[PDB]
Structure 1
Amino acid sequence: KREHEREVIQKAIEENNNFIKMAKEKLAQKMESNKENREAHLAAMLERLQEKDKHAEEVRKNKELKEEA
């Protein structure tokens, strides 16, 4: 009986800890996935804006090439 009593309380401890654990891991995983996704969304936005700058340089380059001719 005494051994079973010990087995019950240490099972309660084990389950409380496993809950805390999985909660901690679930959260850290979520906050990391969100961080990577938001940065990728911003990175793509700038990537498109920087291609507008490159395009603008080609426009001004094309004008300079048309001028003297």
Structure 2
Amino acid sequence: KREHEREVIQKAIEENNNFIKMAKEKLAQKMESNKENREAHLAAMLERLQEKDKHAEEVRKNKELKE
């Protein structure tokens, strides 16, 4: 009975520690996955805007050639 009493409380400790550990990892995965997604969306936005800047220089370069 003494060894069963020790296995019960060891199980309780292991269950609580596992809940803490898995909650800590899931949250660290969500925050990292969210950081990558938001940065990727801002990167695509700027790349589209920079595509507009090169087009404005090709327009200015095209006007200069026809002079």
TM-score by shorter chain over 0.5: yes
Alignment partners' CA distance in 2, 1:7 and 1:51 = 65
Structure 1 unaligned runs (5+)? none
Give structure 1 regions of 4+ aligned residues with deviation exceeding 3 angstroms.
none
Aligned length: 66
Structure 2 unaligned runs (5+)? none
- Residue 48 of structure 1 deviates from its aligned partner by 0.2
- Residue 63 of structure 1 deviates from its aligned partner by 0.2
- Residue 65 of structure 1 deviates from its aligned partner by 0.3
Aligned-pair identity (%): 100
Q: Secondary structure at the match of 2:54?
A: helix
Alignment partners' CA distance in 1, 2:50 and 2:32 = 27
Alignment partners' CA distance in 1, 2:7 and 2:64 = 85
The one-character-per-residue Cα deviations of 1:3-51 (angstroms, maximum 9, x if unpaired) are 0000000000000000000000000000000000000000000000000
Root-mean-square deviation (CA, aligned residues, Å) is: 0.2
